[PDB]
Each structure stands twice: as structure tokens, then as C-alpha cells.
Amino acid sequence: LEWTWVEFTVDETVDVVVCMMYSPGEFYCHFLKDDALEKLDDLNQSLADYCAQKPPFKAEIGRPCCAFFSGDGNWYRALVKEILPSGNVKVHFVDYGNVEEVTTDQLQAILPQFLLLPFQGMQCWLVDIQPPNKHWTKEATARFQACVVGLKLQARVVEITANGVGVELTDLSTPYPKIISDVLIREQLVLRCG
């Protein structure tokens, strides 16, 4: 089995929506390119059909699979993260960035044609900022949430790695462009990486 993350070129501007959110150094974005959100929804419908069959699984680290999310009762794409002392396994939901605990009956084998679409839960962080103390305050997390929730921001991909990208987010909902990182620095909630 083979799979991929969404790819970028340096300084690529592209629209995003933040789905998951833990800190300014850790959040997950859906990137609006190549009809990603349209294709992801179609994929999840296909997976509901396939995973509604007579149980077609050898759970091993880094193996792709169909995991069942109890939080809404549907099957989504996943990667095995850890195997616990119990018969339970920790998985990462690759299209959304969250990690959960599930029983072995809540896992399935994934067919190759459901891997053709890149995984869409892109790990992200704001570039050129740091924690003022040494860990992120929750007041910094809270305004970052405030400024991004249910909003379609412009992202500029400033640094690429194998395991996530560093971005600069801009809210263009008014003629005054609100660059998030500058807002967190100007409001003394984080320090610049000068």
C-alpha cells in the first residue's frame, strides 16, 4: 500500500480552513486546492459503502486502514499509531488530524483506490513566532481560535517539511488584511522569532 500528503511549492499562496486546533505551533488545515473538499466528501461516501459489508485486519504501526470514529459513527481513513497492552489501538485520522483509541473490531483493511487522494489533515504552525514564557498560554490559543474559527483564510506556505508545513495565515474578510501572526505579536501574546 502507498499514500501521500498534499504537496506544495515554496511561497505557494492557497486558501485554507482550520479544522483541528491545539496551539499556534500545532493545528490542522484543509487546503482548498484540486477540489480537495469535494473529493474528500465523495471518498467518505465510498468508504461508508465499502465498510458496510461482511467484515473484510492485521493492525501494525504505520499501516493504512479504515477506522470507525465513535464521535459521529462513521468510517474514515486512518494510520495505526500505537498498539496498547489491551487489544486496542491508537490511530491518527489522516484527513482531520485527530488521534483516538479504538477496539480491533473498529478497524478494517483499506483498498488501494481509497488511497489515490492525498491525505488532507495537514499539520501546520505559524512561522516566525515563539512562546513568550516557554509553553503556549491558553489566552494565545484562544485568540488564535477567535481569529480563525469558521473562516476561510489565505495561507502562504513559507516552509515545507515531510511532516507538516509552516504557514502565514491572512484573513481577507475586510480591506484591512489581518495577518494572524502579526496580530498575536502586536497584542503581546507571542514573541517574534527575531
Domain, as residue range, for 174:
1-30+117-194
Cell (9 digits) for 121: 489533515
Closest CA to 35 of 120, 92, 98, 97: 120
Query: Within this chain, do residues 173 and 132 fall inside the same structural domain, yes or no?
Result: yes
Cell (9 digits) for 5: 500528503
Report how far residue 60's alpha carbon sits from residue 81's, in angstroms, rounded to the nearest whole number: 8
Please answer whether residues 167 and 157 qualify as being in contact, where contact means their C-beta atoms are separated by less than 8 angstroms.
Answer: yes
**Domains held by the chain: number:** 2
Alpha-carbon 4 to chain mean position: 14
Q: Report the SS3 class of residue 103.
A: strand
CATH number at residue 4: 2.40.50.90
Please answer whether residues 81 and 63 qualify as being in contact, where contact means their C-beta atoms are separated by less than 8 angstroms.
Answer: no
What pairs with residue 166 in β-bridges? Answer: 125, 159
Report how far residue 69's alpha carbon sits from residue 134's, in angstroms, rounded to the nearest whole number: 34
In 112-190, DSSP assigns E strands to 122-126, 129-130, 153-160, 165-171, 178-179
> Cell numbers 480591506 label which residue?
175
